[PDB]
Amino acid sequence: RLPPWLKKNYNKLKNTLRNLNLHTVCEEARCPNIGECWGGGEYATATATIMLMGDTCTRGCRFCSVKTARNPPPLDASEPYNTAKAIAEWGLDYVVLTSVDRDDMPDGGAEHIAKTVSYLKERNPKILVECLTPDFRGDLKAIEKVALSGLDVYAHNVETVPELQSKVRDPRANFDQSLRVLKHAKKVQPDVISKTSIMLGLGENDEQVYATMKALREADVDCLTLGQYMQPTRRHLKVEEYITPEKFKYWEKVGNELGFHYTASGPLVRSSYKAGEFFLKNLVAKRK
Numbered sequence: 001r002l003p004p005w006l007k008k009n010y011n012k013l014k015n016t017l018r019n020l021n022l023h024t025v026c027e028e029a030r031c032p033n034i035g036e037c038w039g040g041g042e043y044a045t046a047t048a049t050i051m052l053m054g055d056t057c058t059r060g061c062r063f064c065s066v067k068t069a070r071n072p073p074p075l076d077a078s079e080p081y082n083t084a085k086a087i088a089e090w091g092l093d094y095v096v097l098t099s100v101d102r103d104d105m106p107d108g109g110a111e112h113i114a115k116t117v118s119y120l121k122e123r124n125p126k127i128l129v130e131c132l133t134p135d136f137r138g139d140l141k142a143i144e145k146v147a148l149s150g151l152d153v154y155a156h157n158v159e160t161v162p163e164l165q166s167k168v169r170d171p172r173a174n175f176d177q178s179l180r181v182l183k184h185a186k187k188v189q190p191d192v193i194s195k196t197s198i199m200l201g202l203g204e205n206d207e208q209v210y211a212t213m214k215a216l217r218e219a220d221v222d223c224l225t226l227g228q229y230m231q232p233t234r235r236h237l238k239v240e241e242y243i244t245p246e247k248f249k250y251w252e253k254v255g256n257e258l259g260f261h262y263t264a265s266g267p268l269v270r271s272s273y274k275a276g277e278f279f280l281k282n283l284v285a286k287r288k
C-alpha cells in the first residue's frame with residue numbers, strides 16, 4: 001500500500017478534449033496529477049503531454065511502462081499536422097511534446113518532432129512549447145534539428161544518478177550522452193531553456209544526488225525536476241524506498257542554492273508536472 005502522499009478548469013479542458021482527435025499521456029497513463037496540471041494551479045494554466053511517433057518504443061527501460069518492440073510501425077506522416085492542430089484548438093497554455101525512442105530511424109525521429117513544433121508555433125505563437133526528446137544516440141545533427149525548431153524549452157532526462165544508469169535505463173542511454181544532448185541544445189540555440197528530470201527511490205544516496213545536480217549545473221541545465229519512482233507493474237524495477245515529502249523539500253532548497261532557475265521537487269512530480277505553472281512563475285515571473 002502506497003504512502004498517503006502518493007494518492008471548473010479541469011472539466012472545461014476535459015469537455016473540449018472529448019471532441020478533438022487528441023490523446024494524452026495524462027489520461028493514457030492515468031496520471032495522478034491531471035487535476036493539478038489541467039488548470040488547477042495558481043496561474044490556472046493548462047499543461048498536458050502528447051507522445052509522438054507511436055505507442056511502441058525501441059528501448060526497454062526497466063522503470064518505464066511504454067510497450068517495447070524492435071520494429072515499430074512507420075511514422076504517421078499526418079501526426080505533426082493533426083497534433084499541432086488539435087493542441088491549438090484545445091486551447092492549451094504550455095504543451096510538452098514527447099515521444100518514444102525510434103532507434104530504427106536514422107535521425108531518431110528528430111525531423112518528425114521538429115515538424116510538429118514548427119506547425120504549432122505558426123498556428124499559435126502564444127503557446128509555450130516544451131519538447132522532451134530522446135537522446136538520438138548522441139547524434140548532434142538530430143539534436144540540432146529539434147533545438148532550432150522554435151521550441152521554448154528543450155528537455156531531456158538523465159533519469160537517475162550516473163552510478164545507476166546501467167540498472168535503470170536501456171543500455172543505449174547513458175549519463176554523459178544525456179548531458180551532451182542538453183549541452184548541444186544550448187550551443188545550437190543559446191536562448192532555449194534546458195530542462196532535465198531525475199527519479200528518486202531507485203537506490204541512489206544523497207551524495208550521488210548532490211554530485212549529479214552539481215554536474216547538471218556545470219552543463220548549464222536551467223531547470224530540474226525530482227520525483228518519486230513509482231513501479232508501474234510488478235515486472236518493473238522494485239522501488240527501493242519512498243522519499244519523504246520533507247526530503248523532497250530539502251532537495252528543492254539544494255537546487256535553489258545551486259542556481260537552478262526552478263527545482264520542481266515532490267513525490268508526485270514528473271517531468272511534465274505543472275510544467276506551465278513552473279515556467280510562468282519562475283522564468284516569466286508573471287504577476288497575477
Ligand code: MET
Nearest residue numbers: 098099100101133134135
Ligand atoms: C517518454 S520517455 C522520454 C522521452 C524519450 N523516450 C526518452 O526516454 O528519452
Ligand code: SF4
Nearest residue numbers: 026031034037272273
Ligand atoms: S504530470 Fe505529465 S502526464 Fe501527468 S497530468 Fe501533468 S502533464 Fe499530464
Ligand code: SF4
Nearest residue numbers: 057059061064066101
Ligand atoms: S526510451 Fe523513453 S519511452 Fe522508451 S522505454 Fe526508455 S523511458 Fe520509456
